[PDB]
Enzyme design. Structure first.
Site, PDB file in Angstrom:
ATOM      1  N   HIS A 151     -32.134  44.584 -52.992  1.00 46.04           N
ATOM      2  CA  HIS A 151     -32.354  43.544 -53.696  1.00 46.04           C
ATOM      3  C   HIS A 151     -30.881  43.473 -54.570  1.00 46.04           C
ATOM      4  CE1 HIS A 151     -33.714  39.633 -55.151  1.00 46.04           C
ATOM      5  NE2 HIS A 151     -33.381  40.028 -56.246  1.00 46.04           N
TER       6      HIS A 151
ATOM      7  N   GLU B  61     -35.159  44.171 -49.318  1.00 43.40           N
ATOM      8  CA  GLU B  61     -35.537  43.320 -50.762  1.00 43.40           C
ATOM      9  C   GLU B  61     -36.443  43.893 -51.591  1.00 43.40           C
ATOM     10  OE1 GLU B  61     -33.576  40.906 -51.625  1.00 43.40           O
ATOM     11  OE2 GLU B  61     -32.685  40.068 -49.900  1.00 43.40           O
TER      12      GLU B  61
ATOM     13  N   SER C 129     -30.997  35.397 -55.618  1.00 44.21           N
ATOM     14  CA  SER C 129     -32.411  35.490 -56.306  1.00 44.21           C
ATOM     15  C   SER C 129     -32.806  34.417 -56.800  1.00 44.21           C
ATOM     16  CB  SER C 129     -32.296  36.789 -57.285  1.00 44.21           C
ATOM     17  OG  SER C 129     -33.397  36.987 -57.907  1.00 44.21           O
TER      18      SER C 129
HETATM   19  C1  LIG Z   1     -31.062  40.148 -58.566  1.00 38.20           C
HETATM   20  N1  LIG Z   1     -30.312  41.143 -59.470  1.00 38.20           N
HETATM   21  C2  LIG Z   1     -30.290  40.904 -61.017  1.00 38.20           C
HETATM   22  C3  LIG Z   1     -30.792  42.649 -58.937  1.00 38.20           C
HETATM   23  C4  LIG Z   1     -30.844  43.552 -60.316  1.00 38.20           C
HETATM   24  N2  LIG Z   1     -32.109  44.061 -60.675  1.00 38.20           N
HETATM   25  C5  LIG Z   1     -33.097  43.193 -60.931  1.00 38.20           C
HETATM   26  C6  LIG Z   1     -34.351  43.802 -61.832  1.00 38.20           C
HETATM   27  C7  LIG Z   1     -35.480  42.939 -62.376  1.00 38.20           C
HETATM   28  C8  LIG Z   1     -36.517  43.608 -62.842  1.00 38.20           C
HETATM   29  C9  LIG Z   1     -36.269  44.601 -64.097  1.00 38.20           C
HETATM   30  C10 LIG Z   1     -37.283  45.050 -64.445  1.00 38.20           C
HETATM   31  N3  LIG Z   1     -38.667  45.042 -64.243  1.00 38.20           N
HETATM   32  C11 LIG Z   1     -38.866  44.344 -63.174  1.00 38.20           C
HETATM   33  C12 LIG Z   1     -38.018  43.587 -62.282  1.00 38.20           C
HETATM   34  C13 LIG Z   1     -35.484  41.739 -61.703  1.00 38.20           C
HETATM   35  C14 LIG Z   1     -36.361  40.609 -61.715  1.00 38.20           C
HETATM   36  C15 LIG Z   1     -37.323  40.263 -62.880  1.00 38.20           C
HETATM   37  C16 LIG Z   1     -38.255  39.335 -62.685  1.00 38.20           C
HETATM   38  C17 LIG Z   1     -38.681  38.437 -61.573  1.00 38.20           C
HETATM   39  C18 LIG Z   1     -39.636  37.580 -61.591  1.00 38.20           C
HETATM   40  C19 LIG Z   1     -39.522  36.939 -60.223  1.00 38.20           C
HETATM   41  C20 LIG Z   1     -38.946  37.250 -59.023  1.00 38.20           C
HETATM   42  C21 LIG Z   1     -38.174  38.435 -59.161  1.00 38.20           C
HETATM   43  C22 LIG Z   1     -37.693  38.872 -60.609  1.00 38.20           C
HETATM   44  C23 LIG Z   1     -36.821  40.045 -60.645  1.00 38.20           C
HETATM   45  N4  LIG Z   1     -34.462  41.086 -61.011  1.00 38.20           N
HETATM   46  N5  LIG Z   1     -33.397  41.967 -60.524  1.00 38.20           N
END
Ligand SMILES: CN(C)CCNc1cc(-c2ccncc2)c(-c2ccc3ccccc3c2)nn1
Ligand SMILES: *[C@@H]1O[C@H](CO[C@@H]2O[C@@H](C)[C@@H](O)[C@@H](O)[C@@H]2O)[C@@H](O[C@@H]2O[C@H](CO)[C@@H](O)[C@H](O)[C@H]2NC(C)=O)[C@H](O)[C@H]1NC(C)=O
Ligand SMILES: *[C@@H]1O[C@H](CO[C@@H]2O[C@@H](C)[C@@H](O)[C@@H](O)[C@@H]2O)[C@@H](O)[C@H](O)[C@H]1NC(C)=O
Ligand SMILES: *[C@@H]1O[C@H](CO[C@@H]2O[C@@H](C)[C@@H](O)[C@@H](O)[C@@H]2O)[C@@H](O)[C@H](O)[C@H]1NC(C)=O
Ligand SMILES: *[C@@H]1O[C@H](CO[C@@H]2O[C@@H](C)[C@@H](O)[C@@H](O)[C@@H]2O)[C@@H](O)[C@H](O)[C@H]1NC(C)=O
Ligand SMILES: *[C@@H]1O[C@H](CO)[C@@H](O)[C@H](O)[C@H]1NC(C)=O
Ligand SMILES: *[C@@H]1O[C@H](CO)[C@@H](O)[C@H](O)[C@H]1NC(C)=O
Length: 527
Positions: free
Chosen positions: A436, A323, A196
């Protein structure tokens, strides 16, 4: 007892029993002066030598961040929330080395994602002891500052120059260069891998001249710098820094006096205003992120990619089948982790306004037009699945494919995978699919614990992925050469072959999401 002398002093680790064997973990070794007081927002300062024995026997503090509280008590969300105290004192790293100590072992450096706002290395699904045990590699991971505390920017000004969290990462790679041989690792054989925002970080280290000599190879899981959320422009980066200053009452004219004001603010007050620096926001908003600082990153990265200005080496790149689904339960109307989320056309239309808020009517019409021309318009999941694919293709899959095309065109070997196995322990519902972030537990080999409730088919899948990842790290070639496995072909720009990963089969295919990605990379960027 086990004591390693480092360039800054002695550290003591702990003994782990893994699979009838032993791994030596050093959890929480500092790699910089803590970025506190007058050091907040600044580049990480190097660390002064200590003469005692540092007890690296516990994960250290996670960097300050906002926590996901949308699903209190739900393991599917909370397993990603920090599992150690938050603090500004958080520039620490971890090392897992095989026991008995290796001689010249390949080193894997993990960089977590979280949109540059969240994440921490101490999470259970980033536990490096399995890889150390099974492949006899050394695994390193580090904490790096996130949010405004890691990416606030007034470009030029060194009191807040931007990209500090990237420089955190970079100072940690330097630590591996100066210290890993004492742990038994080969500094000439280091592979960065991340997922990510972590994968986007890895791709920018490929671009940063200051990182060229700090690693050998790169693995990018579900992320790359050319993703639309990855790099903030200098206009909106400054608009965000100013807006934060107004919200904290820190508005000054001497732009340095603004930084001094934001430095007397409690980490809380800063955190709790980060969300409103943007006029309209989405679940994927990167409030404070990487920017073109002229230090870590000397030009807009899409130009660097397009014109071949990067470290020439091998890349392993890939993405997951679904994703996009994860973000639809954080705002899209009609969606729920607790029902099948059949939505209507009007619901789909309203969902584009959430994910594309500052886009023209025509721009949103054009998304609807390309994704809602069905074979069977009677399928009642049509709109539910279209919106997931819309968010996944735009934000992850197509930028990842475009990154691999452009990178390979300069002669380097590239390998692209398509992970399409839905974990049997996955706590989100079925309509969300191969989500994802849920290849990560397979990359780290958690299904190798028979005690851990996965199926046998998943143990075998993990075992081969762990082998392919490690053969790529050690040899730049992610084959599994013994258990009569499918050869993974290199990704070339004409033919564009990629490998699928699942418990069922393992196929070579060509030209992933070709029709969808022409829309996102060639039409939509004009709207
Ligand atoms: C990859 N692993 C850690 C998956 C575990 N879960 C999550 C949850 C979230 C999330 C939580 C709450 N609200 C929205 C998004 C996000 C997240 C937050 C901000 C972002 C900005 C730009 C691109 C991607 C983004 C992703 N990323 N991962
Ligand atoms: C699926 O659920 C969504 C979300 O509703 C929530 O989750 C349910 C399982 C239940 O606990 C509800 O009380 C929760 O609100 C539903 O979307 C909502 O639908 C209602 C009436 O249909 C509407 O007034 C709301 O605005 C919608 N949005 C929210 C955020 O509540 C949706 O209808 C459910 N769909 C199916 C097919 O079950
Ligand atoms: C560092 O550790 C020394 C050795 O003790 C071992 O580590 C500690 C953290 C305990 O878990 C103990 O059971 C282990 O055997 C200690 O003697 C020493 O005091 C510690 N020093 C500091 C500053 O923590
Ligand atoms: C730049 O910042 C402008 C300042 O507006 C302030 O910030 C926004 C986020 C809101 O909170 C608003 O009420 C505040 O007065 C914004 O108006 C503007 O939209 C921002 N973006 C651009 C592209 O100019
Ligand atoms: C390969 O498979 C092993 C179990 O399968 C047995 O061993 C292989 C080598 C074949 O001879 C097969 O017929 C046997 O049943 C696993 O224990 C081993 O870890 C696997 N290795 C990899 C890299 O996936
Ligand atoms: C480790 O391997 C490198 C080549 O990859 C070699 O130059 C170096 O001397 C080796 N050192 C040790 C201590 O094994
Ligand atoms: C801002 O204040 C600092 C510290 O007092 C000073 O060094 C700097 O020159 C000032 N800059 C401007 C533009 O007023």
């Amino acid at each position: 007892d086990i004591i390693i002398a480092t360039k800054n002093g002695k550290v003591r680790g702990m003994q782990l029993t893994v699979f009838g064997g032993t791994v030596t973990a050093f959890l929480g070794i500092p790699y910089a002066q803590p970025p506190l007081g007058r050091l907040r927002f600044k580049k990480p300062q190097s660390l002064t030598k200590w003469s005692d024995i540092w007890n690296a026997t516990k994960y250290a503090n996670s960097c300050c961040q906002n926590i996901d509280q949308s699903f209190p008590g739900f393991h599917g969300s909370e397993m990603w929330n920090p599992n150690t105290d938050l603090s500004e004192d958080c520039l620490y790293l971890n090392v897992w080395i095989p026991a008995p100590k290796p001689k010249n072992a390949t080193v894997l450096i993990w960089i977590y994602g979280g949109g540059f706002q969240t994440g921490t290395s101490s999470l259970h699904v980033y536990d490096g002891k399995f890889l150390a045990r099974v492949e006899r590699v050394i695994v390193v991971s580090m904490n790096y500052r996130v949010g405004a505390l890691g990416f606030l920017a007034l470009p030029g000004n060194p009191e807040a120059p931007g990209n500090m969290g990237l420089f955190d990462q970079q100072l940690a790679l330097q630590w591996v260069q100066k210290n890993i041989a004492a742990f038994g690792g080969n500094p000439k054989s280091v592979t960065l891998f991340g997922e990510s925002a972590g994968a986007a970080s890895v791709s920018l280290h490929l671009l940063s001249p200051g990182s060229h000599s700090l690693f050998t190879r790169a693995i990018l899981q579900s992320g790359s710098f050319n993703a639309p959320w990855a790099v903030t422009s200098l206009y909106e980066a400054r608009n965000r820094t100013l807006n934060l200053a107004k919200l904290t009452g820190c508005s000054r004219e001497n732009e340095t006096e603004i930084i001094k004001c934001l430095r007397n603010k409690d980490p809380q007050e800063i955190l709790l205003n980060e969300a409103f620096v943007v006029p309209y926001g989405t679940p994927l908003s990167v409030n404070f992120g990487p920017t073109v600082d002229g230090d870590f990153l000397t030009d807009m990265p899409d130009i660097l990619l397009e014109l071949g200005q990067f470290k020439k080496t091998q890349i392993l790149v890939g993405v997951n089948k679904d994703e996009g689904t994860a973000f639809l339960v954080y705002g899209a109307p009609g969606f729920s982790k607790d029902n099948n989320s059949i939505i209507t056309r009007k619901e789909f239309q309203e969902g584009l306004k959430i994910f594309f808020p500052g886009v023209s009517e025509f721009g949103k019409e054009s998304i609807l037009f390309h994704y809602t021309d069905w074979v069977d318009d009677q399928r009642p999941e049509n709109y539910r699945e279209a919106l997931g694919d819309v968010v996944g293709d735009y934000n992850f899959i197509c930028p990842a494919l475009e990154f691999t095309k452009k990178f390979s065109e300069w002669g380097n070997n590239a390998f692209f995978y398509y992970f399409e196995h839905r974990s049997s322990k996955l706590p989100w519902p079925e309509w969300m699919g191969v989500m994802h972030g849920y290849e990560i537990e397979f990359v780290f080999g958690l299904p190798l614990e028979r005690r851990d409730q996965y199926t046998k088919a998943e143990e075998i899948l993990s075992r081969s992925i762990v082998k392919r990842w490690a053969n790529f790290a050690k040899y730049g070639n992610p084959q599994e050469t013994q258990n009569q496995s499918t050869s993974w072909p290199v990704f070339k720009s004409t033919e564009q072959k990629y490998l699928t990963l699942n418990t069922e089969s393992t196929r070579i295919m060509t030209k992933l999401r070709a029709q969808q990605c022409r829309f996102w990379t060639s039409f939509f960027p004009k709207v």
